[PDB]
């Protein structure tokens, strides 16, 4: 997907307010400047130019008055998702690498990020459950039949929930961030890999 000394970056802002993102290179060079709204539901990707085949980029995040600096290592020819999340009264970021999954006739592919304090097991299919670890753990990708997933089984050490993953389309790789437990049950934010 991405070329030499190049990356694609998708910013997911899971904070309660807007965040201004400033990605910097090895010499105060602004590789990306973008403000993303709280749960901005966009399938938009930014191409970033690197100085080498591998680089540590500096992510400058602005949220309310607060400023947070996070470093994240990237590599050429790759696509990433920057998950900006709440860190108390402040915010923090995580960089998730995307695997390129060639479309499989009749199939979609899925992956989860667990923001809960308890580990999770998701029943997507007739095989093994999909494990997704507590405190921003990342699940494996699972190739699933295309279709509607209105009540996917989730379970912690002590409860079992339902998630509405909605329609999962062929030729699409999804990312689901398990945000909170409301009165209505478990909540999941849907995003699409590039």
Residue numbers in the entry: 408 to 601
What do the study's own words say?
However, a key structural difference exists between bacterial and mammalian homologs with only the latter containing a large extracellular domain, the function of which is currently unknown.
Following extensive screening, crystals from Rattus norvegicus PepT2, residues 410–601, were also obtained. The phases were calculated from seleno-L-methionine incorporated protein using the SAD method in space group P3221. The crystal structures revealed that in the PepT1ECD there exist two conserved salt bridge interactions stabilizing the interface between lobe 1 and lobe 2, mediated by Asp574-Lys398 and Asp476-Arg490, whereas in PepT2ECD only one equivalent salt bridge interaction is present, between Asp505 and Arg538. Guinier analysis of the scattering data in PRIMUS (Petoukhov et al., 2007) shows that PepT2ECD has a larger radius of gyration (Rg) compared with PepT1ECD, 23.1 versus 18.4 Å, which suggests an increase in particle size. Consistent with this analysis, 3D envelopes of the ECD generated using DAMMIF show that PepT1ECD forms a compact shape ∼48 Å in length whereas PepT2ECD is more elongated, approximately 61 Å in length. The larger envelope of PepT2ECD indicates that the two immunoglobulin-like domains are structurally more dynamic than the PepT1ECD, which is consistent with the loss of the second salt bridge and also the location of Asp505 on the unstructured loop connecting lobes 1 and 2. We identified two highly conserved charged residues, Asp550 and Glu573 in PepT1ECD and Asp576 and Glu599 in PepT2ECD, located on one face of the ECD structure.
